[PDB]
């Protein structure tokens, strides 16, 4: 990706302004629940202003930084895709479950992940990638050994390095692994995305067996799903107490969110920060709460 200068950033801001104006169309009636594009693009704008202010008089330093070059290219691309969604979608955008509205929700989730990453790498607007603290010690040691203090690596280099410790099946498993870890959908793995993935699928010692058991062969796992989409999806099981699904929390990145149908026909969502996901699912099954993953009668045996 090319060098970033102030003129590229301001062009991106103009495109972002066009998106937030399109999204305020009263016929659209977007709900305010996270991930909310009308929160996320303004917050992204404000954080980018903070970054540019920290680099006043040294914009060349910022604009040559590899992570920032990739980030700005991706933000521009994804903002243009959102505009194209409105121009191709026209009145279909006003229908809640239309293809363009589902695409807008997926993009909203991607913008949320991008913002979180940007703040993890530039917490007060200054680049802090070289001292980024990976949460799990065994995962931190992997990154230090393979990549030093690097903040971002291409997917193919990341795959090759990870395969040395946790072998990866070629084909669709490798594709599914990439889709899980590449939260910002940019074909790179940042140290932030690595931190999130290794928190979600801890312990490191069995990382990809955990991921396979919780995300590939578990029908309860939902990729790129929001809180409101979980409520919608479980509505058809409101008559089947114990139906449940789980996904990444979008506002507490690195935490899981489990949605379930209660005995009195409510849909609740909970974040099991007290214990690992494996254990939350095991305990919830034994206690009668997490019985029917995505409404199915058979539940995986995580023992």
């Amino acid at each position: 990706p090319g060098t970033v200068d102030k003129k590229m950033v301001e062009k991106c801001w103009k495109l972002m302004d066009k998106v937030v104006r399109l999204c305020q169309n009263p016929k659209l009636a977007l709900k305010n629940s996270p991930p909310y594009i009308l929160d996320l693009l303004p917050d992204t704008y404000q954080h980018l202003r903070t970054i540019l202010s920290r680099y006043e008089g040294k914009m060349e330093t910022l604009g040559e930084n590899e992570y920032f070059r990739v980030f700005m290219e991706n933000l521009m691309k994804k903002t243009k895709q959102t505009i194209s969604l409105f121009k191709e979608g026209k009145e279909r955008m006003y229908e809640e479950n239309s293809q363009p509205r589902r695409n807008l929700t997926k993009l909203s989730l991607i913008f949320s992940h991008m913002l979180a990453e940007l703040k993890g790498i530039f917490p007060s607007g200054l680049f802090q990638g070289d001292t980024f603290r990976i949460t799990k010690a065994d995962a931190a040691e992997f990154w230090r050994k393979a990549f030093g203090e690097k903040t971002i690596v291409p997917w193919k280099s990341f795959r090759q390095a990870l395969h040395e410790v946790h072998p990866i099946s070629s084909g669709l498993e490798a594709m599914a692994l990439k889709s899980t870890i590449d939260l910002t959908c940019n074909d790179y793995i940042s140290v932030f995305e690595f931190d999130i993935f290794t928190r979600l699928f801890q312990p490191w010692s069995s990382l990809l067996r955990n991921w396979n058991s919780l995300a590939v062969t578990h029908p309860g796992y939902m990729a790129f799903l929001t809180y409101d989409e979980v409520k919608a999806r479980l509505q058809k099981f409101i008559h089947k107490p114990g139906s449940y699904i789980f996904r990444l929390s979008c506002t507490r990145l690195g935490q899981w969110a489990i949605g379930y149908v209660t005995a009195d026909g409510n849909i609740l969502q909970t974040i099991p920060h007290n214990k690992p996901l494996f254990q939350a699912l095991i305990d919830g099954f034994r206690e009668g709460f997490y019985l029917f993953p995505d409404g199915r009668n058979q539940n995986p045996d995580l023992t």
Binding site: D17, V20, Q24, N32, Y36, D39, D43, Q269, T270
Partner: peptide, 24 residues
């Protein structure tokens, strides 16, 4: 009623929050 469209630089994120409840 007016529907005032706010610009990118005028929106202070509402930061509205989804309801997460204690484990069952």
């Amino acid at each position: 009623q007016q529907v005032h469209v706010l610009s990118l630089d005028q929106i202070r994120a509402i930061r509205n929050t989804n309801e997460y409840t204690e484990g069952p």
